[PDB]
Design an enzyme around this catalytic site. Structure first.
Site, PDB file in Angstrom:
ATOM      1  N   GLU A  35       0.845  -1.211   0.000  1.00  0.00           N
ATOM      2  CA  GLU A  35       0.000   0.000   0.000  1.00  0.00           C
ATOM      3  C   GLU A  35       0.864   1.238   0.000  1.00  0.00           C
ATOM      4  O   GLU A  35       0.522   2.224  -0.683  1.00  0.00           O
ATOM      5  CB  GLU A  35      -0.875  -0.002   1.224  1.00  0.00           C
ATOM      6  CG  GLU A  35      -1.968  -1.075   1.137  1.00  0.00           C
ATOM      7  CD  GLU A  35      -3.060  -0.805   0.097  1.00  0.00           C
ATOM      8  OE1 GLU A  35      -3.011   0.313  -0.523  1.00  0.00           O
ATOM      9  OE2 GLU A  35      -3.957  -1.649  -0.094  1.00  0.00           O
ATOM     10  N   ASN A  46      -7.776   8.749  -5.441  1.00  0.00           N
ATOM     11  CA  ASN A  46      -8.620   7.750  -6.143  1.00  0.00           C
ATOM     12  C   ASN A  46      -9.407   8.435  -7.254  1.00  0.00           C
ATOM     13  O   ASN A  46      -9.681   9.641  -7.180  1.00  0.00           O
ATOM     14  CB  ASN A  46      -9.528   7.106  -5.098  1.00  0.00           C
ATOM     15  CG  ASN A  46      -8.793   6.437  -3.959  1.00  0.00           C
ATOM     16  OD1 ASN A  46      -9.147   6.610  -2.796  1.00  0.00           O
ATOM     17  ND2 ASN A  46      -7.752   5.716  -4.305  1.00  0.00           N
ATOM     18  N   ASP A  48     -12.527   8.316  -7.771  1.00  0.00           N
ATOM     19  CA  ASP A  48     -13.817   8.881  -7.301  1.00  0.00           C
ATOM     20  C   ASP A  48     -13.593  10.220  -6.577  1.00  0.00           C
ATOM     21  O   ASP A  48     -14.600  10.861  -6.220  1.00  0.00           O
ATOM     22  CB  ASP A  48     -14.561   7.854  -6.460  1.00  0.00           C
ATOM     23  CG  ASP A  48     -13.904   7.552  -5.120  1.00  0.00           C
ATOM     24  OD1 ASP A  48     -12.852   8.178  -4.812  1.00  0.00           O
ATOM     25  OD2 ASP A  48     -14.421   6.712  -4.372  1.00  0.00           O
ATOM     26  N   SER A  50     -11.871  10.694  -3.742  1.00  0.00           N
ATOM     27  CA  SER A  50     -11.327  10.415  -2.419  1.00  0.00           C
ATOM     28  C   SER A  50      -9.797  10.273  -2.528  1.00  0.00           C
ATOM     29  O   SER A  50      -9.244  10.207  -3.579  1.00  0.00           O
ATOM     30  CB  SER A  50     -11.970   9.183  -1.856  1.00  0.00           C
ATOM     31  OG  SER A  50     -11.605   8.003  -2.564  1.00  0.00           O
ATOM     32  N   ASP A  52      -6.388   8.209  -0.398  1.00  0.00           N
ATOM     33  CA  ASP A  52      -5.891   7.195   0.561  1.00  0.00           C
ATOM     34  C   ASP A  52      -4.667   7.742   1.265  1.00  0.00           C
ATOM     35  O   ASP A  52      -3.768   8.351   0.628  1.00  0.00           O
ATOM     36  CB  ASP A  52      -5.506   5.907  -0.135  1.00  0.00           C
ATOM     37  CG  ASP A  52      -6.649   5.131  -0.740  1.00  0.00           C
ATOM     38  OD1 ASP A  52      -7.809   5.383  -0.444  1.00  0.00           O
ATOM     39  OD2 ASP A  52      -6.306   4.120  -1.484  1.00  0.00           O
ATOM     40  N   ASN A  59      -8.875   5.249   3.265  1.00  0.00           N
ATOM     41  CA  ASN A  59      -9.634   6.027   2.261  1.00  0.00           C
ATOM     42  C   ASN A  59     -10.528   7.068   2.941  1.00  0.00           C
ATOM     43  O   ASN A  59     -11.356   6.674   3.776  1.00  0.00           O
ATOM     44  CB  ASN A  59     -10.363   4.988   1.393  1.00  0.00           C
ATOM     45  CG  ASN A  59     -11.042   5.542   0.169  1.00  0.00           C
ATOM     46  OD1 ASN A  59     -11.741   6.538   0.287  1.00  0.00           O
ATOM     47  ND2 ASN A  59     -10.930   4.843  -0.961  1.00  0.00           N
TER      48      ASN A  59
END
Ligand SMILES: [Cl-]
Ligand SMILES: [Cl-]
Ligand SMILES: [Cl-]
Ligand SMILES: [Cl-]
Ligand SMILES: [Cl-]
Ligand SMILES: [Cl-]
Ligand code: NA
Length: 129
Positions: A35, A46, A48, A50, A52, A59
């Site tokens: 990650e 992301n 959308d 958002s 992380d 998120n």
């Protein structure tokens, strides 16, 4: 902070992630490796809108507040910036909530694609735990 593999394993173990919801320490170290590359400051946007955050790429769509993810929740009740600290306490506390959500570690796409069903014990080899 870029943690060493065994440094991060020890920190995760102290904060109670070893065998949390049945996931051995190597699962958590593997997830962090893929990650964030063990970098607490890692951030990634992301599709959308958002973002992380941190060592376990938590998120803002659900778990933390960054003030720029419309219609999102803050289920860990924390600013997303707290997930970038050198101290992993906030990230571990929030990860415990995420992994308790019903899909276990499948919540972490890199865990599901890169760690699940592999020899994750290899991630804590040599560590004095
Ligand atoms: Cl393990
Ligand atoms: Cl805000
Ligand atoms: Cl927001
Ligand atoms: Cl820490
Ligand atoms: Cl599970
Ligand atoms: Cl196998
Ligand atoms: Na949010």
């Amino acid at each position: 902070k870029v943690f060493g593999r065994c440094e991060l394993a020890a920190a995760m173990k102290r904060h109670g992630l070893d065998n949390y919801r049945g996931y051995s320490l190597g699962n958590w170290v593997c997830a962090a490796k893929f990650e964030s590359n063990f970098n607490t400051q890692a951030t990634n946007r992301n599709t959308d809108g958002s973002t992380d955050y941190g060592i376990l790429q938590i998120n803002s769509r659900w778990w933390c507040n960054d003030g720029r993810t419309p219609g999102s929740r803050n289920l860990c009740n924390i600013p997303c910036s707290a997930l970038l600290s050198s101290d992993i306490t906030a990230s571990v506390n929030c990860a415990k909530k995420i992994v308790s959500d019903g899909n276990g570690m499948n919540a972490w796409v890199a865990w599901r694609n890169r760690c699940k069903g592999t020899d994750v014990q290899a991630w804590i080899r040599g560590c004095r735990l």
